[PDB]
Each structure stands twice: as C-alpha cells, then as structure tokens.
C-alpha cells in the first residue's frame, strides 16, 4: 500500500542517522518503465528521482513538505533487456545529503545517478501568475502529437504512459501544459507522490518555453524541488524559461482545483 | 464547499476587499447546540480559525494560511428567543480581518475576532516527534473528568463538544486524542478543522497548567495559527504550556499518520 519506489530499509547499528532503501527496479513491478527508452535501452526518467527521494524521506520522517536542493543528475539509470533487473539504493546521510545508486549484476562498482540534499519543509510558493489567470497568460497552442514526434525522431521512444500531455499552451519564455494520468497507471499513481511519468512530462512541457519554430534537452540540475501536495489525476504545469546547450526554467505544478503540488526553482537541462 | 463560508458580493469601488455573509442558524449547524455557556449557544472562539481560513481559501486558493495576532474579545451568541444572527467575515486589502455579527433589530455590528491573515506558513517545529509523543506524556487523565469540570462551572457541553477520547499529560505538557463524532462525521470533511475539534484542542491544553480545581479558561489571544492540512477523523493535539489568570501554550495538531495539521504559537487564554 506504501509508496511503490521505496524499498526495504535495514537500520545499521554504528550508523544511527543513516538511511538506506533498496529496490529491484524490474519491469514486472513497474511495467510503465517500458515506455521511456532512450536510443534503445529503458531509462528510469531523471525526473522520477524526485518522487523517489521524497517518498523515501516521507517514510523516514513522516508526511508533509520536503525540499530537495542542488540536485545533480549525471549518469543514467538503465533497465537493460539482456541482463536482470538492476538494484537501486537511496543513500541518505546524517548530514541530509542523498545519493541514488545502482548496481547491475556482476558489476564491481555502484553507479551514482543522482546527488543532492533534502530537508523537511519548503518556502512559501510564489506563482508569478495565479492559477485562474494561467489560461490567458499563455495564448498560443501547440499540438502535443508534434512534441512527442520530435522526441522519437531524435531517439526517445516514448510509450503511452509517457505520452500524457493532453493540452499545451505557450507564450514568450513561458509554457502551460495539462498532464493527465493514463489508465495504465491510474490505480498505482495515488501511491506515488508525483508519478515519474507525470514528473517527466513536466520537463517535456518546459521544453516548449525555448523559442522554437530540434535540440533535445534532459534534466541536469535542479536548485530546489519543493513538494507540497500529492498529484491528482489531472495536472497543470506552468513553466517560465530563463535565458549554449543548457536550457533552464522555473516550474509550478498545480492540481485542477488549484492546489499547488510542487515548485521547481532552477530546473536546468542539457542536450 | 466549506460550510462556514457564505455569499460574497465583490464591491466595485473596493477591489481588494472581501466580505462573506452567513446566517448562523441551528438548522444549518445543529452541532451549535452542544456548546452553551451559562445558557445561550456560543460559537466557539476556536471556530473562528476554521472560518477565516476557509474564507481565505475561497478567495485565494487551497494551501497553507497563517492567522497572526488574533484577538478574541466579545462572544458570538446564537440566542434561542431571537432569529439566527448574521455573520460577516470582513477581509481588508491590508489582509487585516474582522469577524462581525448583527442580532435582529440591532443598530450596530459586534466585533468578535480581529487579526491578520496571510498565505503560507513557517516550517513547523515540533519539540517532540510524533512517534515519541506517547511516551513524553506518561500520566493519564479521565476525559469524563474534564467535561465534568466545564459543566460544573457553567459550560454545558453536548456530545459534539465531548470529543476527547484519550488524554495524557506531564509537567507543562498535555496530549489528547480528538475524535470526530458521528453527528458531524458526514459534514467534517467539508471543513478544514471542524470548530468542535478546534475547541477540543484548547480543552486539551487546559490540562497542562492544571495541577490535581476550578478555573475555566477561554480563548483570548493567538500569536500565530498556521494551517497545514485538513483534519482527519482522529487527531492528536500536543500542548506545552507557558508559565495571573491568563493561560498560554503552544499547540501542534497531528493526524493519525503523523501529518501535521496545524501549529498554534502563543495560544493565550482567560478566565
């Protein structure tokens, strides 16, 4: 019944404020993994790491607001088809520094995928445009089928569960996207805080803020991710881009009733 | 919608002013019967916090709100001989609020509550984590003992305001379990924190000063009330008193899973 991405924890005696969760990230436990392939292999979406770490922190310290600051994404997490499911470790230090690690079977070394800090609580969120006014602030509309098309044309095989933007609007250095939970994940998504598929789609949405009539971007840095409330079945993602091959922007995720879900400050990306 | 937020009629020459109007009758709110003070029905001074924050929620949206420097001065009566009073939540552009009532045939409105309100809240600082709460308060008191004191001193409390199922205490400490009764179960999810349970929080705190006894205290001042999450069916209120006839304490409201619901800083009281 718990958060599906938080695994077993085995509190070690000589390390009292250290927390380690272990999880086998197989397709049987997570069929949706199939629908985010990058040039062939299945990749756990770099966005997904935020639902993972905060779900872990939630299990240790309790429900509420958590903030994940100075996240670095460096090495992709693969779920290959030829080898068995990888093992994944969320290591939280006493200093509240975290790392996400993976080991493929027969490998000598763990691979660090994500790195940052995490704390309880979050600043008061400051949307530059209130929820109701959002619709009008982004006049122009773009076809979601074209956005998905671009991704695959550059080698990003996105299946139904990662094709979840139903509507999308934009303006100068801004974007607004509607994220709908697909049926394939419906029963399982309320167990997550913000399902990785929907978290990935938020970064998809931001990519339309860079002025384009080409250059694919992937999560690289995040100054602050502040979780405020669980995602519902329908989501409104409002992005504002900042002005090389590094895209940057700030993000505000809302539920349809207008409840802020999460705030991203400094969501940097890379080709 | 929130049952205590009424009609709002935005006035043209006053754009940042909000006024909600409500007839506080027993038919709309049967639970009102169960908090009488020396005869007449009194809207609990604690209830003013669910009212103002429900109003602010309606204007600005769901999320965290903080009500600072609340003064309670004059009781809000729902007499039996006269028709239901009218109640007005006036929110100024400066985010200063007042709660007013007019009884039938009266020339002037009566100010009941006064303070400010803003969006957001500080990160909450429980001095004892939720899990450790149980052990921090060893000694137990009989709730039928506390309701008895109130009645003996002229506070006729009916079933809906007898909601403390369990109560534990220590030096300058208290811990109470607040249960939503069946009579309002159907209506409580519409409130943020039903007034009955909000009143019971102050009931709980009164056991932190008291030493095993006849001095009733009633809400008077609150430096800060910070709302974080809707109340559930079971609630744990942890109070810590501060050391004339003005009691004061800090309160931390928790749900069963340990989700902080509300923080009270500087909850002063008066005989």
From TrEMBL, chain A:
Residues 139-271 are annotated as: C-terminal hotdog fold. Residues 3-125 are annotated as: N-terminal hotdog fold. Residues 3-271 form the PKS/mFAS DH domain. Coiled coil: none annotated. It comes from the Bacteria. The active site is at 36 (proton acceptor), 200 (proton donor). Fatty acid synthetase is a multifunctional enzyme that catalyzes the de novo biosynthesis of long-chain saturated fatty acids starting from acetyl-CoA and malonyl-CoA in the presence of NADPH. This multifunctional protein contains 7 catalytic activities and a site for the binding of the prosthetic group 4'-phosphopantetheine of the acyl carrier protein ([ACP]) domain. This is Uncharacterized protein. The chain holds residues 909 to 1187 of 2811 of the full protein.
